[PDB]
Design an enzyme around this catalytic site. Structure first.
Site, PDB file in Angstrom:
ATOM      1  N   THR A  71     -31.326  68.446  57.806  1.00 25.23           N
ATOM      2  CA  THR A  71     -32.324  70.368  57.836  1.00 25.23           C
ATOM      3  C   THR A  71     -33.128  69.005  58.664  1.00 25.23           C
ATOM      4  O   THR A  71     -34.403  70.114  59.745  1.00 25.23           O
ATOM      5  CB  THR A  71     -31.819  70.799  56.697  1.00 25.23           C
ATOM      6  N   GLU A  86     -24.161  51.932  27.593  1.00 24.78           N
ATOM      7  CA  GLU A  86     -23.283  50.928  28.168  1.00 24.78           C
ATOM      8  C   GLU A  86     -23.127  50.687  29.257  1.00 24.78           C
ATOM      9  O   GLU A  86     -22.802  50.237  30.329  1.00 24.78           O
ATOM     10  CB  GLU A  86     -21.952  52.110  26.917  1.00 24.78           C
ATOM     11  N   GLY A 129     -34.888  70.593  43.546  1.00 25.71           N
ATOM     12  CA  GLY A 129     -34.612  71.053  45.126  1.00 25.71           C
ATOM     13  C   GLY A 129     -34.132  71.938  45.638  1.00 25.71           C
ATOM     14  O   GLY A 129     -33.281  72.011  44.607  1.00 25.71           O
ATOM     15  N   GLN A 130     -34.107  72.427  46.683  1.00 22.00           N
ATOM     16  CA  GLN A 130     -32.368  72.720  46.833  1.00 22.00           C
ATOM     17  C   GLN A 130     -31.048  72.078  46.785  1.00 22.00           C
ATOM     18  O   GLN A 130     -30.297  73.008  45.701  1.00 22.00           O
ATOM     19  CB  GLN A 130     -31.934  73.603  48.566  1.00 22.00           C
ATOM     20  N   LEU A 136     -25.245  56.053  27.320  1.00 30.48           N
ATOM     21  CA  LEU A 136     -25.812  56.307  28.206  1.00 30.48           C
ATOM     22  C   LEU A 136     -26.982  54.554  28.349  1.00 30.48           C
ATOM     23  O   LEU A 136     -26.587  53.721  29.771  1.00 30.48           O
ATOM     24  CB  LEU A 136     -27.833  56.514  27.803  1.00 30.48           C
ATOM     25  N   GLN A 171     -28.869  73.266  43.636  1.00 33.17           N
ATOM     26  CA  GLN A 171     -27.286  73.665  44.346  1.00 33.17           C
ATOM     27  C   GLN A 171     -25.821  73.202  43.658  1.00 33.17           C
ATOM     28  O   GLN A 171     -24.784  73.350  43.044  1.00 33.17           O
ATOM     29  CB  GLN A 171     -26.843  73.999  45.636  1.00 33.17           C
TER      30      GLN A 171
HETATM   31  N1  LIG Z   1     -24.876  67.895  48.721  1.00 29.25           N
HETATM   32  C1  LIG Z   1     -25.742  69.222  49.186  1.00 29.25           C
HETATM   33  N2  LIG Z   1     -26.958  68.850  49.795  1.00 29.25           N
HETATM   34  C2  LIG Z   1     -27.905  69.134  49.742  1.00 29.25           C
HETATM   35  C3  LIG Z   1     -28.153  70.886  49.354  1.00 29.25           C
HETATM   36  N3  LIG Z   1     -28.469  70.944  49.871  1.00 29.25           N
HETATM   37  C4  LIG Z   1     -29.524  70.373  51.035  1.00 29.25           C
HETATM   38  N4  LIG Z   1     -28.458  69.579  50.662  1.00 29.25           N
HETATM   39  C5  LIG Z   1     -28.748  68.188  51.671  1.00 29.25           C
HETATM   40  O1  LIG Z   1     -30.950  67.843  51.304  1.00 29.25           O
HETATM   41  C6  LIG Z   1     -30.993  67.692  52.714  1.00 29.25           C
HETATM   42  C7  LIG Z   1     -32.330  68.573  52.699  1.00 29.25           C
HETATM   43  O2  LIG Z   1     -33.829  68.672  51.503  1.00 29.25           O
HETATM   44  P1  LIG Z   1     -33.577  70.568  50.218  1.00 29.25           P
HETATM   45  O3  LIG Z   1     -32.699  69.448  48.934  1.00 29.25           O
HETATM   46  O4  LIG Z   1     -32.314  70.982  51.086  1.00 29.25           O
HETATM   47  O5  LIG Z   1     -34.246  70.450  50.210  1.00 29.25           O
HETATM   48  P2  LIG Z   1     -35.851  70.258  49.738  1.00 29.25           P
HETATM   49  O6  LIG Z   1     -35.703  69.284  47.859  1.00 29.25           O
HETATM   50  O7  LIG Z   1     -35.787  72.141  48.714  1.00 29.25           O
HETATM   51  O8  LIG Z   1     -37.500  70.412  49.454  1.00 29.25           O
HETATM   52  P3  LIG Z   1     -38.280  71.340  51.014  1.00 29.25           P
HETATM   53  O9  LIG Z   1     -37.850  72.526  51.091  1.00 29.25           O
HETATM   54  O10 LIG Z   1     -39.050  70.714  52.212  1.00 29.25           O
HETATM   55  O11 LIG Z   1     -39.650  72.203  50.055  1.00 29.25           O
HETATM   56  C8  LIG Z   1     -30.099  67.352  53.319  1.00 29.25           C
HETATM   57  O12 LIG Z   1     -29.774  66.132  53.770  1.00 29.25           O
HETATM   58  C9  LIG Z   1     -29.371  68.149  53.199  1.00 29.25           C
HETATM   59  O13 LIG Z   1     -28.445  68.398  53.707  1.00 29.25           O
HETATM   60  C10 LIG Z   1     -26.334  71.080  48.771  1.00 29.25           C
HETATM   61  O14 LIG Z   1     -26.336  71.987  48.653  1.00 29.25           O
HETATM   62  N5  LIG Z   1     -25.437  69.976  48.633  1.00 29.25           N
HETATM   63 MG   LIG Z   2     -36.118  73.517  49.982  1.00 27.32          MG
END
Ligand SMILES: Nc1nc2c(ncn2[C@@H]2O[C@H](COP(=O)(O)OP(=O)(O)OP(=O)(O)O)[C@@H](O)[C@H]2O)c(=O)[nH]1
Ligand SMILES: [Mg+2]
Ligand SMILES: Nc1nc2c(ncn2[C@@H]2O[C@H](COP(=O)(O)OP(=O)(O)O)[C@@H](O)[C@H]2O)c(=O)[nH]1
EC number: 3.6.5.-
Lengths: 48, 431, 432
Positions: free
Chosen positions: B171, B246, B10-11, B244, B15
């Site tokens: 989000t 320990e 996921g995002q 992993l 990231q």
């Molecule tokens: N620390 C951090 N949190 C993130 C980031 N991107 C999203 N989040 C957090 O993750 C949550 C949102 O989920 P996402 O990861 O964006 O969504 P996804 O996994 O891509 O899932 P879908 O878009 O629904 O298919 C929220 O709590 C955001 O604050 C990032 O780059 N860093």
């Molecule tokens: Mg997403």
């Protein structure tokens, strides 16, 4: 006199080492048993 | 030799993965094209016939946007295209879409890629899974993947870096539902999980780095530093290391109580120049300050079961022991009655590396404390209460039911969380 | 009775074992290439007890180096005397034991055990008259502890009539690398009670306390602790490797030291206490050396000898000194401290004097005691074990390897019986 003293001796050391391996072989039969069990429970876990 | 496969879901996961792999390259002297002009780095990077170093990692997202940025970005040559996997339709912040509806289409492809990476390993230790609790992919796809990984990989170690949701950066309204659903489903499949509360990171960036409005770029750079501290012992051969197995042996006393609290120090702004150099005593004292924690909670109200201190840079054992001794004189640090030996210490020679043009200052020495405290249950309670508020009215439940989920799965997930909270309570009671 | 086959298992076992070989090679005038360059016929008289003579003037340690982890082996080869060892005698796995007795004893260890026995059989069949085996290992870890005791059981099966000797290092919270050490130690003690003929109880609690309190080393390292271990190992093996009348072989030592089969755990002592750097020193007379036998400060096991009674004692004096003075001083100590020696074992203190002192010292004394006070070491392990076991803490690490709770209960009960047995003979009287 000596025959029935050294034969009675050879019998009493074969015993004191029979009781050894016999009772320290089941010490491998159990280490096989819980060891089979080790990956058996791991398998029937993936069964679920 | 002792390889570790990293999975970014996921995002949030993708990231954070970008930040981690950028930092690893800086630490090992690997260029963005995989070229490099120890030897332990081989646990995380494989080598090709052209002398290029490739991350032992898979990046997965149900939407292409995030990953498309990696494949256009600075490190586009670092990864082979097959390890960057994307779908068309996202999980729309719905655990049921990520786990069932959308997830089921890409799952087989993702596992085939993971199998190809595993085939390049001679001594695969296991997996490192990075994901958010809140997103539909981060929650739904991760639990689906974790279940499938337990089947295909037998008794292979699986560690998580989970992004605990924060309202300042949240989000979705449904993030408490996704968080509880993913925790319930993944609990029996994970060996050790390191939660990262986005509010704690947001507050550190604001307080320590003087960033008025922190962005994911700011948050991830800081997260990457903690992940690098945990993984430095695998990627380098120091005087004091931890593999992993320990980590888990020292910090995880019971199956379900596998959630250590991370605390990092020092976090210094790239301005000033006078705010350094901090001593071993100063950085150790900073680990016991709730302001440097990765999860918001109060350890003074809980009990410790294990404390691991991971030092990096110009650090001497004599300095460390002196610092631990003064901290022991501060009575306030309570441990469970069944735990004697509290402190396991590790020193890795390399000082913390920072991203050029980043917000973090370069320091001679840093430390990451991993502590298993009953105080982490406070994070579960906050999440569980938000779940209960909505669930009592069945608010938003129809979105999940519509995707083929049953209401019973919600009850089950919540009851499991109640049992987890009860477990942390039972563990803190003296005999 | 001639050859002793040495086995080194795990991190601790290999570290202490490597130091033993560099210390004894120096005493026997053997350099890191295997060549004898000494200038005393006493150095070679009983050289065959620990070394095989290879083609020409070279001497090779009859040592087998074992670990489930490769790194330690590399460190040994890289070491000062690393090149002296038989290349074929290094038997190492790739998958470690992760400080888990179950992995060392049942899983990973069981997979490597046969490769080790193959090397021990090669060394044993070369022997004119094999005395038995000497194993160095820790009880707190996974390889040294679990695999080490597995090896003891497998060797005992093939060589049931040979003497089984160990140098077992006891874990301590003062110098601990893992929270599960009480479990690993208890599971190992259960094995040693049943399978060894003699065990030297080398306590890290006592070694740390000596370094910190006596040697004034603020932060002791394994190097500091190992300097005391190697001094002790050199002392307790003096009788086996140099010409002498008393305890000249493993069986004679056992016959003189072990009155009851299970009570074969020795409390070693050493005087004078020295630090790695300390090559000073100007001290230690015969009355001074003798007085440190009852000195709890000089014990390698964290027990007070005055808290129990000596069943049997072997005392080895090293250096140029009067045998008359030694005999007088030794008799004085037994007469003055009558109450700390059992009355139902007549003439239970045996003394030996060797002209060759250890390196750096002109005069030294090594004590080997079979004391009822050793129950303090076992009680410490049992209480640490029960604190964890009461709550079934970390049990998943062991049950996950296929182990059952019963084995834990059995090991604990066996160790408590051992404590009860020491107490029984502590309270026994010659009232007849
Ligand atoms: N620390 C951090 N949190 C993130 C980031 N991107 C999203 N989040 C957090 O993750 C949550 C949102 O989920 P996402 O990861 O964006 O969504 P996804 O996994 O891509 O899932 P879908 O878009 O629904 O298919 C929220 O709590 C955001 O604050 C990032 O780059 N860093
Ligand atoms: Mg997403
Ligand atoms: N005296 C001493 N103790 C050691 C040494 N290395 C480890 N230990 C101790 O041994 C125990 C850990 O076992 P270890 O030998 O490292 O594990 P293994 O490799 O699985 O046998 C603990 O009680 C440590 O304190 C060493 O070189 N010297």
């Amino acid at each position: 006199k000596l025959a029935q003293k050294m034969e009675s001796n050879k019998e009493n050391r074969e015993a004191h080492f029979a009781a050894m391996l016999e009772r320290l072989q089941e010490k491998d039969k159990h280490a096989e048993e819980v060891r089979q069990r080790a990956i058996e429970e791991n398998n029937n876990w993936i069964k679920m | 030799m002792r390889e570790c496969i990293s999975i970014h879901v996921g995002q949030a996961g993708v990231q954070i993965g970008n930040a981690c792999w950028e930092l690893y390259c800086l630490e090992h002297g690997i260029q963005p094209d995989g070229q490099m002009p120890d030897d332990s780095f081989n646990t995380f990077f494989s080598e090709t016939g052209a002398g290029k170093h490739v991350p032992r990692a898979v990046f997965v997202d149900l939407e292409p946007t995030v990953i498309d940025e990696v494949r256009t970005g600075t490190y586009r040559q670092l990864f082979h295209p097959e390890q960057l996997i994307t779908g068309k339709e996202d999980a729309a912040n719905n655990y049921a879409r990520g786990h069932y509806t959308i997830g089921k289409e890409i799952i087989d492809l993702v596992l085939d890629r993971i199998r190809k990476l595993a085939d390049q390993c001679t001594g695969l230790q296991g997996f490192l899974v990075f994901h958010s609790f809140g997103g539909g992919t981060g929650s739904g796809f991760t639990s689906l993947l974790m279940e499938r990984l337990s089947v295909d990989y037998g008794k292979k170690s699986k560690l998580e870096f989970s992004i605990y949701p924060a309202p300042q950066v949240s989000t979705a309204v449904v993030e408490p539902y996704n968080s509880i659903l993913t925790t319930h489903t993944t609990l029996e499949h994970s060996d050790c999980a390191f939660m990262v509360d986005n509010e704690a990171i947001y507050d550190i960036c604001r307080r320590n780095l003087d960033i008025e409005r922190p962005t994911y770029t700011n948050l991830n750079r800081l997260i990457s530093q903690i992940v690098s501290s945990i993984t430095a012992s695998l990627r380098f051969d120091g005087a004091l290391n931890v593999d992993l197995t320990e980590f888990q042996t020292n910090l995880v006393p019971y199956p379900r109580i596998h959630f250590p609290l991370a605390t990092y120090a020092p976090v210094i702004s790239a301005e000033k120049a006078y705010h350094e150099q901090l001593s071993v005593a100063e950085i150790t004292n900073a680990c016991f300050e709730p302001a440097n924690q990765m999860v918001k909670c109060d350890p003074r109200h809980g009990k410790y079961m294990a404390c691991c201190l991971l030092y990096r840079g110009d650090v001497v054992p004599k300095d460390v022991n002196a610092a631990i001794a003064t901290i022991k004189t501060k009575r306030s640090i309570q441990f469970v009655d069944w735990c004697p030996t509290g402190f396991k210490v590790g020193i890795n020679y390399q000082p913390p590396t920072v991203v050029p043009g980043g917000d973090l200052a370069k320091v001679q020495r840093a430390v990451c404390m991993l502590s298993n405290t009953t105080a982490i249950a406070e994070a579960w309670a906050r999440l569980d209460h938000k779940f209960d508020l909505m669930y009592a009215k069945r608010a938003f439940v129809h979105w999940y039911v519509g995707e083929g989920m049953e209401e019973g799965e919600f009850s089950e997930a919540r009851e499991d969380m109640a049992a987890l909270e009860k477990d942390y309570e039972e563990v803190g009671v003296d005999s | 009775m001639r050859e002793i086959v040495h086995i080194q298992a795990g991190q601790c076992g290999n570290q202490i074992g490597a130091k033993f070989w560099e210390v004894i090679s120096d005493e026997h005038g053997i350099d890191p290439t295997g060549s004898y360059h000494g200038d005393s016929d006493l150095q070679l008289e009983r050289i065959n007890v620990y070394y095989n003579e290879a083609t020409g003037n070279k001497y090779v340690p009859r040592a087998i180096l074992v670990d489930l982890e490769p790194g330690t082996m590399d460190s040994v080869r890289s070491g000062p005397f690393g090149q002296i060892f038989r290349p074929d005698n290094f038997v190492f796995g790739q998958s470690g034991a992760g400080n888990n007795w179950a992995k060392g004893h049942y899983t990973e260890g069981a997979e490597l055990v046969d490769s080790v026995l193959d090397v021990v059989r090669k060394e044993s069949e070369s022997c004119d008259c094999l005395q038995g085996f000497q194993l160095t290992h820790s009880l707190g870890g996974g390889t040294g502890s679990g695999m080490g005791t597995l090896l003891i059981s497998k060797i005992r099966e093939e060589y049931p009539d040979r003497i089984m000797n160990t140098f077992s290092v006891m874990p301590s919270p003062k110098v601990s690398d893992t929270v599960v050490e009480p479990y690993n130690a208890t599971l190992s003690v259960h094995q040693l009670v049943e399978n060894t003929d003699e065990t030297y109880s080398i306590d890290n609690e006592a070694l740390y306390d000596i370094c910190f309190r006596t040697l004034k080393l603020t932060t002791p390292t394994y190097g500091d602790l190992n300097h005391l271990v190697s001094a002790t190992m050199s002392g307790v093996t003096t009788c086996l490797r140099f010409p002498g009348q008393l305890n000249a072989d493993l069986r004679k030592l056992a016959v003189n030291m072990v009155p009851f089969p299970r009570l074969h755990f020795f409390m070693p002592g050493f005087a004078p206490l020295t630090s790695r750097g300390s090559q000073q020193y100007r001290a230690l007379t015969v009355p001074e050396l003798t007085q440190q036998m009852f000195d709890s400060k000089n014990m390698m096991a964290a027990c007070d000898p005055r808290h129990g009674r000596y069943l049997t004692v072997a005392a080895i004096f090293r250096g140029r000194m009067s045998m008359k003075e030694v005999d007088e001083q030794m008799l004085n100590v037994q007469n003055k401290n009558s109450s700390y020696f059992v009355e139902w074992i007549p003439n239970n203190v045996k003394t030996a004097v060797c002209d060759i002192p250890p390196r750096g010292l002109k005069m030294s004394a090594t004590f080997i005691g079979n004391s009822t006070a050793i129950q303090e070491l076992f009680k410490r392990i049992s209480e640490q074990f029960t604190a964890m076991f009461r709550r079934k803490a970390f049990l998943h690490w062991y049950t996950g390897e296929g182990m059952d709770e019963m084995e834990f209960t059995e090991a604990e009960s066996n160790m408590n019986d051992l404590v009860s047995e020491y107490q029984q003979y502590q309270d026994a009287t010659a009232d007849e």
